Design an enzyme around this catalytic site. Structure first.
Site, short mmCIF file in Angstrom:
data_model
loop_
_atom_site.label_atom_id
_atom_site.label_comp_id
_atom_site.label_asym_id
_atom_site.label_seq_id
_atom_site.Cartn_x
_atom_site.Cartn_y
_atom_site.Cartn_z
N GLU A 1 44.67 -35.44 -42.64
CA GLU A 1 45.57 -34.48 -43.31
C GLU A 1 46.94 -35.07 -43.55
O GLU A 1 47.73 -34.58 -44.36
CB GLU A 1 45.72 -33.20 -42.49
CG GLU A 1 46.37 -33.40 -41.15
CD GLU A 1 46.38 -32.14 -40.31
OE1 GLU A 1 47.44 -31.88 -39.69
OE2 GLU A 1 45.36 -31.39 -40.28
N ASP B 1 42.75 -25.06 -40.02
CA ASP B 1 44.21 -25.17 -40.24
C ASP B 1 44.63 -26.63 -40.18
O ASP B 1 45.81 -26.94 -40.31
CB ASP B 1 44.96 -24.41 -39.16
CG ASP B 1 46.44 -24.27 -39.46
OD1 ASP B 1 46.76 -23.81 -40.59
OD2 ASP B 1 47.27 -24.61 -38.56
N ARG C 1 42.95 -29.60 -33.74
CA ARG C 1 43.27 -30.91 -34.32
C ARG C 1 42.14 -31.33 -35.20
O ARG C 1 40.96 -31.21 -34.82
CB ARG C 1 43.47 -31.95 -33.23
CG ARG C 1 44.61 -31.72 -32.24
CD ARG C 1 46.00 -31.77 -32.85
NE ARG C 1 46.30 -33.06 -33.46
CZ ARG C 1 46.72 -34.14 -32.81
NH1 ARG C 1 46.91 -34.13 -31.49
NH2 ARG C 1 46.90 -35.26 -33.48
N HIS D 1 48.11 -26.61 -41.82
CA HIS D 1 48.64 -26.67 -40.46
C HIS D 1 49.79 -25.68 -40.30
O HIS D 1 50.84 -25.99 -39.74
CB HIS D 1 49.05 -28.12 -40.07
CG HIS D 1 48.60 -28.52 -38.69
ND1 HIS D 1 48.91 -27.79 -37.55
CD2 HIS D 1 47.84 -29.56 -38.26
CE1 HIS D 1 48.35 -28.35 -36.49
NE2 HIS D 1 47.70 -29.43 -36.89
#
Lengths: 329, 329, 329, 329
Positions: B264, B259, B235, B295
């Site tokens: 985001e 990621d 996260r 992600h």
């Protein structure tokens, strides 16, 4: 025990002290490689380690080596073609070499490139650079254990590739001309056509021979699955580059990882301007589903250490007329 | 047996027919998320599968599912934030979700990114882009069996990362606040400080909670090795991005694979213009020793299928008054 | 292409048909091994595969082979000592051999014996035979990943042992006189004293040489940990048996798995009466924390197939004056 | 902080002092299981750790724990059969247990037994006992990477068996009634009939329930391959012992490794006379292609420690009004 070291790399320099201690010898590092112009510098030395840029072709070198009691030519590489054996025989100068650097170093670069290309990280980056942060179906991936790997040739390096992939759960098939019982735990042997048709990731581990030049070309690409990924960390000349570029542009394959390319000699291992870089490389370099690295699969601390240490061991054994592991003569 | 599917992804659409055949049920696909606007399309439906973009706030939706005999809400995702659980209890609506899509999907993205950055492929690229095709020591790499992996948190994902890394021969350490005996063949539990200090590759597997926000900050970067590779596929808010950027700029770590990133939500999963993309992303994306993906660690065929088939299966069961595996509080 | 096969085993007979097809040749199986008494039977044959019980010492055999056009001696074993090279040279009779059967076959027997002895299954059985079905602390065990393995010598077989154990999570150390980069993923090299002091399970993979006879004796057992387990699937003569028996009776070690024993030639591979079995074997055979197998580590379908096929390939190549993998001359 | 420990094993006693130091608590050991006779020894105790031999029936024990401020019952074991849960609720007594001792302990016993039987070490022994030291084909073995493993049920244990077998290169199939995506790198789900038909080694990992008693019977043995190896380290009553014995006697399977047997309760964990041991055991114990162990798959240092430290930890927590990981219905 003072050994001359020609054409040391920055990485080899970092090792000198450790190396000297471990072997009880002094290393005399000389910036250029061995020529007629600087051979006069092994005089105070008992042996020579070489990394030849160019052919060792002119006899004043081979003779003057023997004049100083030098008995061996310790190559820090596998590559032998730079040594004129006729001369070496002519001065009872043995040639040693370093056949195996670290097979995992190269195996790991192959696996790494394959994984990145499987996950399409480059294609995601090219999307993102245009402001597209979505997850379109065309960038969907899969777990490695749902993939089949195909190896063309095996050897020490392929065997390490198979070990890694099969340990992540992938099915590994391999075509080879020799049978090795010790790699069976990790792959299943199959003929060439089957490897090409069935593999999701194909990696080259064949020696370059006149029979293997261009062994991957238009016909093989057409046989490959359309979502297949080709990796070549073996020899650039195994793959017809134009056939490759076209297969990538046609989407007859999905991606490619190349640590080596045909005609890399013009530019790999050098600094160059834009006009010095060939057009095939520029085309591949612009594709988000392609990796090209400058033949650096070998390039780990272990390989650098082994190149130095293996060659030095043989070369000191031979100074003491003791026997040596990697004679080539 | 008919199950409404709300807001399918493109990848989800592609599996539909096969899933029908496999479950012998019919899937009614609705393009949008469930809303008062589309609820009456559930009328001929046994159960519902949700992928809510936004809060499911209105109560008439819930009254009306209950009116249509619908006995549960099948989240296809993990997060239940947009479910008003209060209304759920009111209308006897069990809520299920998909906690475990494919832990290997995520673990493999983490490993892949770590290996690429370890091999400094992007740094070789940035160098080649300027015509430098050499092998300087600053780009030397190392075999993965010489590295220590440090996991902050384990869980199903971290555990899979540990299995893969230890199967390549790496030493794996993990910090965690619960003990699982089944992970010990692949890792050794250690103190949080030991992990940051000794790991060459750090991967995060910690739930985002109040107490874990910016868990990796200035002080933690200072504790890591300067050639450390930080991977966050858990996260974004676990990591203080400013401190990350600074650390990279100062070469207090060697690389990062993300990621997920704090904030985001503004741009991940969207198409946007340059002016809409934040500056911290733009800094990261420009660094050749960083990877950022949108992600997408989860985004394999297995995950997308499991998200449908696991919810569908609990959803059918509860429609049959049978037990669901993943009921939620 | 008719090849004589001397001294076939029951297992080799099961393969003849398959083998004939795969190689496009006929196999002429002859019950005894090759002597003066039956060499007259290669007349209708183009080559010979041998499994010699006893020395091939009398020249009427070597001469009469050449009389019939035979060019090669295809041993189906590694063992070379049964062939008088002086004669073979004397009749341009090459010798081939089978150096590698299946290293995993032997590695797997070693691991298997180690595991059984770790779990003390034999000691449990001896307890149970007296009516004791409890779990006393003296029969407590541990998971393999909490063990250190130590290899004395490596080679193909040791390397396979290390691969297996390290894949179950064990720490594998190894003493060797040669360095092989390819086994580093799976073990850490260390000196002999460290291997003996630290290992929980020790396995021998050293060649028998005059310098290695009895290399494991009273002093080494005293150095070993008291709960250590010794495995020897290499060569019986490496271990002083009386020192072993005593170490087991003193509890200076915990257990032993032996596929080979000094003086096994008297009884291994034979049928014998009680008075024919030496007393050391009877002592070891009576201990519940000892396994002795009759040198059968090799004995798998794969090894049997390879012994036949590898030797046959070389031997037909040589009939066609083509080249061969395992010449020894 | 004082925690009473009832009925410790000998192995449990040995860890006590280290556990005190590790938890910074005191452990009051009582030799017997909790009973009305010993309950008042809890009086100075924060919490209790139980290993009940027999039903905890009386209610005054429960009244009195509640009277002494004890807030839970910490089962050190998995089975809760002897807890009268009715009385527990009456006196506000949370019940915890240890579901997961060490899945690797058990999985490794299964693998170990399978490998031993696969190598037919006991059959070689029975043969050597009669003076036959040969290598007949009836005792030929095979490498584990050529075998198929079939799991009936998975769970934490079966999953570990699958990890170990696939890491040796075996193909692993499993039958199960719930899907776990995290096991797929190591096994492939299949129908129950496929598993029995295709597996060379079958290992059981199914809970004993009404519907699973004699799940492996006459009809199932008839379906298995005749050289199949059956392993049961789950629960004896899953297997019809009569049918097992018959199958072995008829060579309809090749071998069996049992850590548990129907009716084992009469003799497992006891010392008894020959007349007290049942005939079915005596038949099995006489077969050199069978292993029987006294339900000791669990019996490693890790398990015994985890049984103490996991219960202790939940027990301390509930004494602190904090959360337990393994509360039970």
């Amino acid at each position: 025990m003072k050994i001359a070291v020609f054409s040391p790399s920055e990485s080899e320099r970092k090792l000198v002290a450790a190396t000297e201690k471990k072997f009880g010898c002094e290393l005399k590092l000389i910036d250029e490689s061995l020529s007629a112009e600087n051979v006069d510098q092994v005089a105070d030395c008992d042996g020579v380690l070489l990394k030849p840029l160019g052919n060792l072709d002119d006899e004043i070198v081979y003779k003057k080596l023997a004049d100083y009691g030098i008995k061996s030519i310790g190559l820090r590489i596998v590559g032998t073609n730079t040594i004129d054996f006729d001369l070496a025989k002519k001065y009872h100068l043995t040639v040693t070499n370093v056949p195996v650097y670290s097979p995992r170093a190269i195996a790991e670069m192959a696996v790494t490139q394959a994984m990145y290309l499987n996950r399409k990280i480059g294609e995601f980056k090219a999307n993102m650079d245009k402001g597209d942060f979505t997850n379109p179906d065309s960038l969907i991936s899969n777990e490695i254990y749902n993939k089949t790997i195909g190896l063309i040739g095996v050897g020490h390096i392929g065997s390490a590739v198979a070990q890694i992939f099969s340990a992540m759960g992938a099915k590994v098939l391999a075509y080879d001309v020799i049978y090795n019982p010790e790699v069976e735990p990790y792959l299943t042997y199959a003929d060439f056509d089957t490897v090409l048709k069935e593999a999701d990731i194909i990696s080259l581990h064949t020696p370059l021979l006149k029979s293997t030049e261009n062994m991957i070309g238009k016909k093989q690409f057409a046989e490959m699955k359309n979502d297949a990924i080709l990796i070549n960390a073996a020899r650039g000349e195994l793959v017809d580059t134009a056939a490759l570029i076209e297969a990538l542009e046609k989407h007859e394959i999905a991606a490619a990882g190349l640590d080596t390319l045909a005609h890399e000699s013009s530019y790999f291992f050098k600094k160059v301007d834009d006009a010095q870089i060939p057009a095939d490389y520029k085309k591949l370099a612009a594709m988000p589903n392609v990796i090209v690295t400058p033949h650096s699969a070998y390039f780990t601390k272990t390989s650098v250490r082994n190149m130095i240490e293996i060659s030095l061991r043989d070369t000191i054994a031979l100074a003491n007329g003791e026997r040596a592991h990697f004679v080539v003569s």
